[PDB]
Amino acid sequence: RIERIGAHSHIRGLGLDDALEPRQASQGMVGQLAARRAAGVVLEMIREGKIAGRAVLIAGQPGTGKTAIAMGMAQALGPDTPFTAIAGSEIFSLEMSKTEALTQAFRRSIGVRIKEETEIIEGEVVEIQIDRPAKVGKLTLKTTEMETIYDLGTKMIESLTKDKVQAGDVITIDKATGKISKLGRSFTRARDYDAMGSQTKFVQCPDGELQKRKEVVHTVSLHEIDVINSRTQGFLALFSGDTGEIKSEVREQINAKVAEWREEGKAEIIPGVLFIDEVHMLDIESFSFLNRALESDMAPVLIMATNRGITRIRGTSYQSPHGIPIDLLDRLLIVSTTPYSEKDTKQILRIRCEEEDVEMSEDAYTVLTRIGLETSLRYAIQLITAASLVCRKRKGTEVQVDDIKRVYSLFLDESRSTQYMKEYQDA
Amino acid sequence: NLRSLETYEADKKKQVHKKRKCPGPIITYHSVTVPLPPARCSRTFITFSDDAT
Ligand SMILES: Nc1ncnc2c1ncn2[C@@H]1O[C@H](COP(=O)(O)OP(=O)(O)O)[C@@H](O)[C@H]1O
């Protein structure tokens, strides 16, 4: 519950209507109807997943809400669909090539819902009488509507001895493997032992004696390749990034078995999204790889964001729009974000204030909207926070003009920093 | 009696056989629910066959 509000916490989805009509202000967003409708339609395409290898480029001036609309789409997509957010400079690893990192990122945003039929027996253990030789045992499971006694085997008795199960424990035994899983207790333990005090759990299902076809959908991403590349996979799946596995017999074989599962009804493919923020940091080799990697059937939807116009492509000398080669730039379609006006700026500032739980006068809102239209929006939020803190220190109830104007001089913007920078501190 | 014989064409006997096969010093861990749905609690018992154990 203790998680602080970040720069994109004010947004909590992409405000859209039944007909995908964008709204002025909803779900923490304001203005920018065109790019928001583009986000809505690409999100509909993602949730459809019928087509693979689609790319979208979010372009615009800084502070136009590129990362904002990206996080909004991520939120609107909701759980059950992977959304791999990554920065352009994260692919540069000292233990795995750029192409390998891109393959990892692509396969990481693809999920397979594996269906598994289970048969679990549950109930209340009324009698767990076990005859230890130092071989024979019987279990008396009880439910709210029926009871049954089961003769326990040697291995089952040993498993029960492993996980201590006293009378009155709510357990869920899997008839397939016999794994002992304790859920709780139905009553106290004799009220006499001067220890082991806990709370009592609710009774089990009436038909819990034998659940026939308990369906559990195990969801896992296509990053499962780490499970095969090495005999010990947890080390690679948890921390180790040195996963330069062999592409042959791993990628192709896993894809083939995933197709077999999809055809045989075991699992279903759920393509996610790969959001590369500041994609301009990718080397030209990474762009050349994305050009081809984006053509596979397992290719997720590649959302990218650029904050530049004509700029040199990293790893070469010639320039291209958005710092992306002409090929990949032409392949994808671009979503331009128009700057926000004064009203939109004021509304965004008000939404941020509401998020931060801070209140300020109308004149404060006006002067702060002015300052934000002049300097920037993020700087306006910084001033919101600073003025709220100055007001709290001042013992006031709401932020007045005298606090925003004070924190404006206390904290400087880059435009004024460079102005006072004429002291030639260093070069 | 004839009908009983013809229809006889027991698990308790197999349990008694298992008991026979037991060397004799068998300790049994036994816990049952006992009263203080109705209020109740769990009680634990550990039966020792012979004094050796
Ligand atoms: N539509 C918007 N609604 C609310 N805040 C926005 C919006 N657009 C930009 N911002 C704010 O501007 C700052 C930077 O803009 P951002 O959302 O990152 O877009 P960009 O990626 O173009 O900078 C962030 O602090 C963000 O909160």
Question: In whole angstroms, what is the distance from residue A391 CA to residue A232 CA?
Answer: 56
Tell me which residue of A120, A42, A110 sits closest to A262, measured CA to CA. A110
> B-chain residues within 8 Å CB-CB of A131?
22, 26-28
| Residue A404, H or E segment | helix A401-410
The size of chain A, in residues, is: 427
Spell out the residues 6+ positions from residue A213 whose beta carbon is closer than 8 angstroms to its own.
Answer: A117, A118, A119
Distance between CA atoms of residues A182 and A188, nearest Å? 15
Are A299 and A52 within 8 A, CB to CB? yes
Interface contact A168-B33, CB threshold 8 A: yes
Residues of chain A with CATH 1.10.8.60: 341-427
The H-assigned helical ranges of A163-304 are 226-229, 234-238, 251-264, 284-293
Q: DSSP state, A42? A: H
Coil, helix or strand for A172?
strand
Ligand 1 pocket test target in A23, A33, A334, A348 with most atoms within 8 Å of CB: A348
Q: Are strands A301-306 and A55-60 parallel, antiparallel or unpaired?
A: parallel
Backbone torsions φ then ψ of A195, nearest 5 degrees: -175, 175
- Rounded Cα gap, residues A294 and A91, in angstroms: 16
Q: Which CATH superfamily is domain A6-110+221-340 in?
A: P-loop containing nucleotide triphosphate hydrolases (3.40.50.300)
- Cβ atoms within 10 Å, residue A245: 19
Q: Which listed CATH number (2.40.30.10, 1.10.1270.20, 3.10.28.10, 1.10.8.60) goes with A341-427?
A: 1.10.8.60
B15, B33, B36: residue with CB nearest A126: B33
How close, in Å, is residue A188 to chain B by CA atoms? 5
Within 8 A by CB and 6+ apart from A209, the residues are A121, A122, A123, A141, A143, A146, A147, A148
Domain with CATH 3.40.50.300 in chain A: 6-110+221-340
User: What is the token pair recorded at A97?
Assistant: 């090539």
Q: Give the whole-angstrom CA distance, residue A216 versus residue A301.
A: 28
PDB resolution in Å: 3.2
* Residue at token pair 């081809």: A292
Picking from B30, B39, B40, the nearest residue to A129 by CB comes out as B30
Is A372 marked as binding a ligand?
no
**Residue whose entry in the numeric block shows the structure tokens 């948890």:** A238
Q: How far apart are CA A174 and CA A214, in angstroms?
A: 10
In 3D, which of A329, A295, A222, A259 has the Cα closest to residue A53? Answer: A295
B36 lies within 8 A of chain A by CB: yes
A191 touches chain B (CB under 8 A): yes
CB A59 within 8 A of CB A303: no
Name the DSSP class of A91.
S
**Whole-angstrom distance, CA of residue A277 vs CA of residue A58:** 9
- In this structure, the residue with its CA closest to atom 23 of ligand 1 is A63
